Structure 1
Amino acid sequence: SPAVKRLLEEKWAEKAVDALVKKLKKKKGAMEELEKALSSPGQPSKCVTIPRSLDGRLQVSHRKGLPHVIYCRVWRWPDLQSHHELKPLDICEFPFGSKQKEVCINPYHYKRVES
């Protein structure tokens, strides 16, 4: 209940972290990994995963988009448009490209590239 506020158009992201924290409060020690990672981009951070839809897309308060794009745009670049502006760092084990069963929504595992 207060985890959402601490992790935090504003009312749409609020609905998005909400969608997220519900998935993370269920995973083991998962909320903890994320709270630390919002603090330091340079400090090492563990992967925080959510399940992957067949589509790839995640729908949040009736808007539908890719998960790492969503949570980056909540926590880093609010002007972020599409996944092309994103690229995964070398740190991350479950990037969106990976097509693996889970997908990392830790916002600092990706850098923004304006092509």
Structure 2
Amino acid sequence: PIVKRLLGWKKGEQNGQEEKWCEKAVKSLVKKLKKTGQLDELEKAITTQNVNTKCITIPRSLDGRLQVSHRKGLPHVIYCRLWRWPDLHSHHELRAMELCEFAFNMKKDEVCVNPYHYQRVET
């Protein structure tokens, strides 16, 4: 369904339990977005690659990490790495685009995980 499709745009790089984990990671995002009705703005953004899409938002946690499968990480890094930069090392190689209100660095209650609202800085 939506998951298999979204996965289509860069299933998951790394040999092994990684493809399965990438699937789990898409599943979490999709489950949460359904609840808030943003699954389609996600669908648009990944496919059309339109930087000026609405902010696809997920709730933040005290420490700001997200756990999928076992694996703990920053929301926006997990997804920019999934659909844009599989090379992405950390949240330092990233920076929002002013047009993102909930751009993580703003410590808001929601976090924009729309991969097209961040640009990768080579520092």
Fold shared, TM-score > 0.5 on shorter chain: yes
Q: Which runs of 5+ in 2 are unaligned?
A: 8-17
> RMSD in angstroms over aligned alpha carbons?
1.1
Q: CA deviation at 1:88?
A: 0.5
TM-score (norm 1): 0.93
Please give the per-residue CA displacement for 1:32-69, whole angstroms capped at 9, x wherever unaligned: 11100012334520011111000000111101010000
1:61 to 61, 69, 77: 69
Partner of 2:14: none
Partner of 1:82: 90
Query: Against the structure 1 CA distance between its residues 90 and 41, is the aligned structure 2 distance closer, same or farther, given a 3 Å change threshold?
Result: farther
Q: CA deviation at 1:102?
A: 0.3
TM-score (norm 2): 0.87
CA distance in 2, matches of 1:10, 1:77: 16
Secondary structure class of the residue paired with 1:39: helix
Number of equivalenced pairs: 113
CA distance in 2, matches of 1:95, 1:65: 16
- The alignment-based identity, stated in percent, is 71
Partner of 2:49: 41
